[PDB]
Amino acid sequence: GWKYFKGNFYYFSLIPKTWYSAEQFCVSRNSHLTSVTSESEQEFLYKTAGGLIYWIGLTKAGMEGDWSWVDDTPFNKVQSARFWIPGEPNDAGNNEHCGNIKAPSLQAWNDAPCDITFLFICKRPYVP
């Protein structure tokens, strides 16, 4: 039940997991929690999400707490500013170190506590 979009397959989970347990599940399926690197990808993801919240590959790295992609796609702070929900990341309780797709819009991302369970999206490259 993987959905194909532009050289990648995506898995929209039916079971909710914590950010890391979801990531482990993806890694066990030769994938990672999805990065988002274009407007068309963001749009594909939030429309497929159908108004439900899904963990994606957003998580903090380094001492400064910069956001990063768990699949090691370099995080482009400038080019991703448009993808956050207005007001996010707000870091609530000083404990929101992972990211999900929340709002059904281009401005979709929210930071949430990593140990909260949500549905999740894996991303797997297609290699011909």
Ligand SMILES: CO[C@H]1O[C@H](CO)[C@@H](O)[C@H](O)[C@@H]1O
């Ligand atoms: C109540 O907290 C929730 O809503 C705020 C926005 O008000 C988000 O930033 C936060 O991560 C939670 O999802």
Ligand SMILES: [Ca+2]
């Ligand atoms: Ca938040």
